[PDB]
């Protein structure tokens, strides 16, 4: 089997991407944030505290003829940005882009933090990191990908995120029409539960390539590119008037600037992030200070290849017995 779904930016900045997911019988379609950095499929629901729901579509298990309470199971998750959610668990039929899993754990939120309530466009998360990170207790649950894997034509999914445009998530096949040149595959460590790999270095604009190992994670659920402070300082030094602002919470630059590109290595291959991808617009409405898309990972304890980097590539998440990542230009 295969599946193929379109993923759509939630706003003009590509702050996140939503993908429609069918849950239950008859189908209830919710718009979920596919997150390769976490392993829970959770939704706004009929159980979510009413004051914490503001415009999201909800899952109502009582209206699904295939929903069953997973008796005694609870979940609770905290993300890198400080947001959180928790609740109880149903099993139900879940379909993505024509690919169906029966008996998927659907984690129903009883509580969500303020950042989730305030985002009316995201109805929940669909985790695509390794199932070792799933938070369900006392019986840990499998991701949608791990439950689908054995049925797929190939044990893979691909992320093809757009810049200010829709893109695609495919399950079970490589679309050889969706990229240019060849795919370069690189080793993955699953020791922290992430799609963790080692970049071979970087360049700023038309500058020389610096060969250096950068360990980090491929995370579709993180908006920005978070790298070591040395690499980030080297990038923003090439932008007149850029500075790190403790008051704003990262590097800002004059909105009048033209940003240089950023290149990262994948083995002997190179992925080029155009400068435009690194502009996240005014810090507040009408400001002439703009927020950068490359930020320091110092204090986060890991480097994160988030959407700014991933949407410059066609990305293969190879879930074979020894997992690997693949990157191609597009
Ligand atoms: Na922000």
UniProtKB/Swiss-Prot annotation:
GO terms for molecular function: aspartic-type endopeptidase activity. The keyword Disulfide bond applies. GO terms for biological process: proteolysis. It catalyses: Hydrolysis of proteins with specificity similar to that of pepsin A, prefers hydrophobic residues at P1 and P1', but does not cleave 14-Ala-|-Leu-15 in the B chain of insulin or Z-Glu-Tyr. Clots milk. Keywords: Aspartyl protease, Disulfide bond, Hydrolase, Protease, Signal, Zymogen. Disulfide bonds join 255-290. Residues 17-328 form the Peptidase A1 domain. Belongs to the peptidase A1 family. This is Endothiapepsin. It comes from Cryphonectria parasitica (Chestnut blight fungus). The gene is EAPA. The chain holds residues 90 to 419 of 419 of the full protein.
